[PDB]
Amino acid sequence: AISKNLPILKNHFRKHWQERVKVHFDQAGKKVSRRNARATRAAKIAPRPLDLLRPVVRAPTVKYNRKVRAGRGFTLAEVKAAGLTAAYARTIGIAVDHRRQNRNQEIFDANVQRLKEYQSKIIVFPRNGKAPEAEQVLSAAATFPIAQPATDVEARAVQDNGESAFRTLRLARSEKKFRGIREKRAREKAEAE
């Protein structure tokens, strides 16, 4: 059970792992049926891509707020900023994420740019039938890449205000820290009897 220096290993195999198993022997296979759907989809879909219009939306957390992410649909605030309605914009080829909203104007911009380049490039035909075919471009998302909203510059001049930045955090943290107890003493000298 335990003899000679080795790491204490937790290997969850006390049950019937030897019953509910699945080595992907269908890796290359289901991977090929994948590329097949692509071409079978096309024959049907006529000149419309394997995916529709997806946005540039920054990612959450203290770890992913660093760079943007391939967003979901498209809010109706960014929908009318383009010039059309959702019950008609989706029937075109643009996603509509109505449960979500936009709280920043800097990114709302990079996202309203994605709605202009895409719409000015959509040769749409009515219920005519003749429809002057103009082929199509493989993937819709791989055709309008990550325009990573302004990374700013990478070469400026020196600027020193002498705050240390290290104490601007030793105190920035002391700010949110004694907020409640420094208001405790500020509660006494708050009410004048």
Binding site: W17, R20, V21, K22, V23, H24, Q27
Partner: protein
């Protein structure tokens, strides 16, 4: 409106005509029979907004259901095992008693497809319920995709599965971290979260 007068009404089941329905329908139940068929809605505000429509191919199943628990089958006071389980009359019933009724009228006439039941009278020996029946045979519902979906053999014995109100409820499957243990179909996520699946060039 009118129906919303009864929407707020079918809320204060505590006095006058409401507390008076306690001393009237309690005996109405213990009178007709136990598991039976009715005619028109008893509470139009509920049924309707929950799925009732006054048109052909429409019937109702008012049913008497017993309360309490489900004492572990095992004869006398024998459980054949370790105490972790032992207990008998002190045993739950993971599915709601409400399902008990549906699953009965539901399989008395499986020619129909169970839409949903509604509560109306709790006592001591029982807890009563009623049912809104969608008929996958009369052209009255078989001419309206407003609720046409019901007739399809993919809806075979609705109630006895969990596609009703009490259903998604009595499945533990709802959106949110309140259900991370099973936000997926019970054994789907179970088999999944334990299954050891390996690659081609094992990483």
């Amino acid at each position: 409106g009118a129906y919303k007068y009864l929407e707020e009404l079918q809320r204060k089941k505590q006095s006058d005509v409401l507390r008076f329905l306690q001393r009237v329908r309690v005996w109405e139940y213990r009178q007709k029979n136990v598991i039976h068929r009715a005619a028109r809605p008893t509470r139009p505000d509920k049924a309707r907004r929950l799925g009732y429509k006054a048109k052909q191919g429409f019937v109702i199943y008012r049913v008497r259901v017993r309360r309490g628990n489900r004492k572990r089958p095992v004869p006398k006071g024998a459980t054949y095992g370790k105490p972790t389980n032992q207990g008998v009359n002190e045993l739950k019933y993971q599915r709601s008693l409400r399902a008990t009724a549906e699953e009965r009228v539901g399989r008395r006439a499986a020619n129909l497809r169970v839409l949903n039941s509604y509560w109306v009278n709790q006592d001591s020996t029982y807890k009563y319920f009623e049912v809104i029946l969608v008929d996958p045979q009369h052209k009255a519902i078989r001419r309206d995709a407003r609720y046409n979906w019901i007739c399809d053999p993919v809806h075979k014995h609705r109630e006895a599965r969990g596609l009703t109100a009490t259903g998604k409820k009595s499945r533990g499957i709802n959106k949110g971290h309140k259900f991370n243990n099973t936000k997926a179909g019970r054994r789907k996520t179970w088999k999944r979260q334990n299954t050891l699946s390996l690659w081609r060039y094992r990483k």
